[PDB]
Amino acid sequence: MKRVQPCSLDPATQKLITNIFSKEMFKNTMALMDLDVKKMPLGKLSKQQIARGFEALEALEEALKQSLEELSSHFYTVIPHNFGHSQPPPINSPELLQAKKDMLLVLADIELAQALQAVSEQEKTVEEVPHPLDRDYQLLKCQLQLLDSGAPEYKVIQTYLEQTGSNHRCPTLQHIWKVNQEGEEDRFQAHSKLGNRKLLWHGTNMAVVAAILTSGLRIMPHSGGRVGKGIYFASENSKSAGYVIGMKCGAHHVGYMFLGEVALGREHHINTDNPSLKSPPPGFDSVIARGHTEPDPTQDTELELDGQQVVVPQGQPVPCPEFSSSTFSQSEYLIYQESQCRLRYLLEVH
Numbered sequence: 001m002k003r004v005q006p007c008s009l010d011p012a013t014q015k016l017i018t019n020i021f022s023k024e025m026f027k028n029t030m031a032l033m034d035l036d037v038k039k040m041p042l043g044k045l046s047k048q049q050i051a052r053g054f055e056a057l058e059a060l061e062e063a064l065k066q067s068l069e070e071l072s073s074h075f076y077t078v079i080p081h082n083f084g085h086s087q088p089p090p091i092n093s094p095e096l097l098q099a100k101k102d103m104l105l106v107l108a109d110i111e112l113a114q115a116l117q118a119v120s121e122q123e124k125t126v127e128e129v130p131h132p133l134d135r136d137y138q139l140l141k142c143q144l145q146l147l148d149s150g151a152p153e154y155k156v157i158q159t160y161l162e163q164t165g166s167n168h169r170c171p172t173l174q175h176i177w178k179v180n181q182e183g184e185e186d187r188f189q190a191h192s193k194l195g196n197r198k199l200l201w202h203g204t205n206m207a208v209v210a211a212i213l214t215s216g217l218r219i220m221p222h223s224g225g226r227v228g229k230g231i232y233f234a235s236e237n238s239k240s241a242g243y244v245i246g247m248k249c250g251a252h253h254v255g256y257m258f259l260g261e262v263a264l265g266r267e268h269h270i271n272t273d274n275p276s277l278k279s280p281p282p283g284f285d286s287v288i289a290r291g292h293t294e295p296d297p298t299q300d301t302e303l304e305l306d307g308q309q310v311v312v313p314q315g316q317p318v319p320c321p322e323f324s325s326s327t328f329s330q331s332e333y334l335i336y337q338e339s340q341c342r343l344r345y346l347l348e349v350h
C-alpha cells in the first residue's frame with residue numbers, strides 16, 4: 001500500500017484544483033450542451049470521436065454552402081445528444097452549425113483534462129504518491145501563486161473588476177492567482193519588440209480552465225465569432241462575464257475569469273462584424289471591434305510585468321462618440337497569433 005503525501009496547496013488553490021478537475025462539473029457542462037453523458041461518459045471520450053464529429057460538421061458546412069437530415073443524423077450518431085427522447089433538430093443554419101462547433105471545442109477541452117489525469121506507468125512504479133490535488137496541480141505544468149490582498153497588482157485588478165463589472169450584479173472577488181504557464185514565457189519573447197501591451201479579460205466555461213492552464217489560449221481550426229478566427233478579449237469585465245459559465249456551489253455561483261497580457265502593437269479599428277477575418281490588415285498586429293463605450297482612458301494605470309509596462313484600464317465605461325454607431329455594444333480585442341498573449345492572472349468570482 002502506497003503512501004499518499006500531504007497536500008502542499010493552500011485552501012483556496014485546493015478548492016480551485018478540485019473545481020477545475022471536478023467530474024460533476026464536467027458532466028454538468030455536457031448536460032448544459034444537451035449531450036448524453038450515459039451514452040458518452042468522461043472515461044469513454046476520445047480525440048477520434050471528437051475528430052469524427054468535426055468531420056460531420058465540415059460535411060454539414062458544405063451542404064449549407066446527401067441531405068441536411070442524413071448528415072445531421074450522422075453527427076448525432078457520432079456525438080450522442082439528449083432531447084427528452086424526441087427527434088434531434090437538423091443542423092440547417094450557420095448559427096446551429098457554429099453552436100455544435102463551440103460545443104465540440106468545449107468537449108475537446110474536457111477530453112484534454114481527462115487525458116491529462118491518466119495514471120501513467122512511471123507514476124505506478126513509485127512507492128509514494130502525491131496528494132490527489134497536488135498530482136492534478138502538477139499535471140497542469142503551470143505555476144499558480146495566490147496573490148496577497150496587499151500586493152499593488154491585487155488593488156489594480158480589483159479596481160479593473162469593480163470599475164468595469166456589471167453595474168448592479170457586480171461579481172464578487174474571492175481570489176486572484178498569478179499564472180506562469182511554463183512554456184508561454186519563451187513564445188511571448190518573439191513579440192518583445194511589439195509594444196501597446198494591455199491587460200485584458202477572457203471569461204470562459206469552468207470546463208475549459210484546466211486545458212487553458214495547461215495549453216494557454218489557442219486558435220482552433222473550427223473557432224470563430226463576430227471578428228473571425230482569433231483570440232477574443234474585452235476591456236470590460238461585464239462583457240467577458242457573459243461568457244463565464246459557473247457552477248452552483250452551496251448558496252453561491254462560483255466562476256473563473258482570466259486576465260491576459262496582450263501585445264496589441266498597431267491596432268486596426270472596426271465598427272461592423274467581420275466573421276471572415278483570419279488576420280489583421282497588413283501593417284497591423286490586432287483588430288479591435290470598437291464598442292459604444294470604453295473604460296475611461298484618462299484613468300489607465302500600468303503594471304510592470306517581466307520588465308515591460310502593461311496598460312491596465314481603471315476607469316468606468318464612458319461613451320466612444322466616434323463608435324456610437326457600431327454594431328458592437330462593448331469592444332472585442334482580437335489577436336490572430338497565440339504568441340501575442342501571455343496569461344497573467346486567474347480570478348475566482350462569486
Ligand SMILES: O=C(/C=C/c1nc(=O)c2ccccc2[nH]1)N[C@H](CO)Cc1ccccc1
Pocket residue numbers: 102103105106201202203204205225232233234239240241242243244245331332333
Ligand atoms: O469560450 C468561449 C468564449 C470566450 C470569450 N471570452 C471573452 O472574454 C470574450 C470577450 C469578448 C468577445 C468574446 C469573448 N469570448 N466560447 C465557447 C466556444 O469555445 C462557447 C461559448 C461559451 C460561453 C457563451 C457562449 C459561447
